[PDB]
């Protein structure tokens, strides 16, 4: 017997983690937004996970942010633009020894979450697992992936990693986790903004070879000035590699705009532009790219941040 896994943000990845953790015998508790969400979830009976067309019900225990026991280990699995507000809703339940697993893409929310929960350890995650919602409390395990974990302040790995190994959650500890998240971010900036502006699948960016190179050019300077020469070196070939590998998919940001939902631009292309200005590094093509993408979002009534 050991620590309960508290899950905040019962979305795509949050339900996928909650299912694999709870079904492997580990103590797991979903933190649902409010009691209405809670009594709906109890009318549903649990989380429904769809694997290769097969649905399975996982009657995981759930609660609201106000009730329950202290939280010593929490998996934050909401969007980056909700992470700070989400973590604050349970700040009254963190224990001081509490550790937080931040399953947020991009950068910005992790620092903002850690700033508001100083008595708690905030670990950074970077995941390539595919999962999408098919109704409330139903998630399809779309694609297998890998999750890098790491703490920039406390680089020693926690002993509960092997619990994730027991649960079949593939992960690797990284001592330079910031180098990981910066690699995924730079890849996002080179691909996703143009997929939205050109309304194309990732394979459509082959028809824009020069423009892809100049963005990787400026994204290369940004990584180099940030201390990641390796990421800056392989960046262009890593971008061209992912393109042909995902040539048939629409990007996550293209899918967000298609559904009329908010994007994570403020923690991806916006954050990268914010960091470049902070580094005194002129990044004009990422700047005009950010301008065109923000106007593209406003044109549809979507938040440009």
Ligand X SMILES: CC(C)(CO)C(=O)C(=O)O
The binding site for ligand X (CB under 6 A) comprises: 187-188, 191-192, 202, 242, 246, 251-252
Bridge pairing between strands 54-58 and 47-51 = antiparallel
Active site residue 79: no
Q: Which of residues 270-299 bind ligand NAD (CB under 6 A)?
A: none
The answer to the question of residue 199 lying near ligand NAD (CB under 6 A) is no
d(CA 100, CA 173): 15
Token pair, residue 125, equals: 């995650």
Q: Which long-range CB contacts under 8 A does 32-39 form with residues at least 24 apart?
A: 32/62, 32/63, 32/64, 33/64, 33/65, 34/64, 35/64, 38/62, 38/63, 38/64
Region near ligand NAD per CB under 6 A, out of 2-10, 114-122, 237-245, 269-277: 2-10
d(CA 273, CA 141): 33
Q: What does 139 interact with, of ligand NAD, ligand X, none (CB < 5 to 8 A by kind)?
A: none
The answer to the question of residue 80 lying near ligand NAD (CB under 6 A) is yes
Q: What does 79 interact with, of ligand X, ligand NAD, none (CB < 5 to 8 A by kind)?
A: ligand NAD
The answer to the question of residue 174 lying near ligand NAD (CB under 6 A) is no
- What are the two backbone dihedrals, phi and then psi, of residue 112, each rounded to the nearest 5 degrees? -70, -35
Q: Which of 25, 45, 59, 85 binds ligand NAD (CB under 6 A)?
A: 85
The DSSP bridge partners found for residue 186 are none
Comparison of 2 and 40: residue with beta carbon closer to ligand NAD: 40
Rounded least distance, CB 9 to ligand NAD, Å: 3
Produce one character per residue of 42-51: b if its CB has 16 or more CB atoms within 10 Å, e if not.
Answer: eeeebbbbbe
The answer to the question of residue 46 lying near ligand NAD (CB under 6 A) is no
Token pair, residue 61, equals: 């225990």
Catalytic residue selected from 184, 208, 262, 296: 184
11 is in an annotated binding site: yes
156 is in an annotated binding site: no
* Short-list 37, 34, 18, CA closest to 26: 18
Region near ligand NAD per CB under 6 A, out of 8-16, 173-181, 280-288, 289-297: 8-16
The DSSP bridge partners found for residue 30 are 7, 62
Comparison of 91 and 242: residue with beta carbon closer to ligand X: 242
Count of CA atoms in the C-beta half-sphere (13 A) of 17: 30
Rg (CA), the chain: 19
Q: Total binding residues for ligand NAD by CB under 6 A?
A: 25
143 is in an annotated binding site: no
Binding mask 129-158 for ligand NAD (x = CB under 6 A): xxx-x-------------------------
Report the binding-site residues: 9-14, 37, 105, 131, 133, 188, 192, 202, 252, 264
Binding site for ligand NAD (CB under 6 A): 8-14, 33, 77-80, 82, 85-86, 89, 103-105, 127, 129-131, 133, 264
């Amino acid at each position: 017997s050991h620590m309960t896994w508290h899950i905040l943000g019962a979305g795509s990845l949050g339900s996928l983690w909650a299912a694999r953790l709870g079904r492997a015998g580990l103590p797991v508790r979903l933190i649902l937004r409010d009691r209405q969400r809670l009594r709906r979830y109890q009318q549903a009976g649990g989380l429904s996970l769809v694997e290769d067309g097969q649905a399975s019900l996982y009657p995981i225990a759930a609660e609201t942010p106000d009730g329950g026991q202290p939280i010593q280990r929490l998996l934050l699995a909401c969007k980056a633009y909700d992470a700070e507000e989400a973590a604050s809703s349970v700040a009254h339940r963190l224990a001081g020894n509490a550790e937080l697993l931040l399953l947020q893409n991009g950068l910005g929310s992790q620092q903002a979450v850690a700033a508001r929960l100083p008595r708690s350890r905030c670990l950074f995650a970077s995941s390539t697992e595919g999962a999408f919602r098919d109704g409330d409390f139903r998630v399809v395990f779309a694609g297998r992936g890998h999750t890098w974990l790491g703490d920039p302040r406390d680089t020693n790995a926690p002993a509960w990693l092997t619990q994730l190994s027991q649960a079949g959650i593939p992960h690797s500890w990284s001592d330079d986790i910031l180098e990981r998240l910066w690699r995924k971010l730079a890849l996002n900036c080179a691909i996703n903004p143009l997929t939205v502006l050109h309304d194309c699948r990732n394979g459509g960016l082959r028809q824009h070879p020069e423009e892809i190179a100049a963005l990787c050019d400026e994204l290369g300077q940004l990584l180099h000035a940030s201390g990641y020469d390796a990421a800056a070196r392989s960046l262009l070939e890593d971008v061209r590699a992912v393109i042909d590998a995902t040539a048939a998919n629409y990007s996550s940001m293209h899918q967000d705009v298609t559904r009329g939902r908010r994007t994570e631009i403020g923690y991806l292309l916006g954050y990268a532009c914010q960091h470049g200005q902070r580094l005194g590094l002129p990044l004009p093509r990422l700047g005009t790219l950010l301008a065109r993408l923000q106007a593209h979002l406003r044109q549809r009534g979507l938040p440009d941040r």
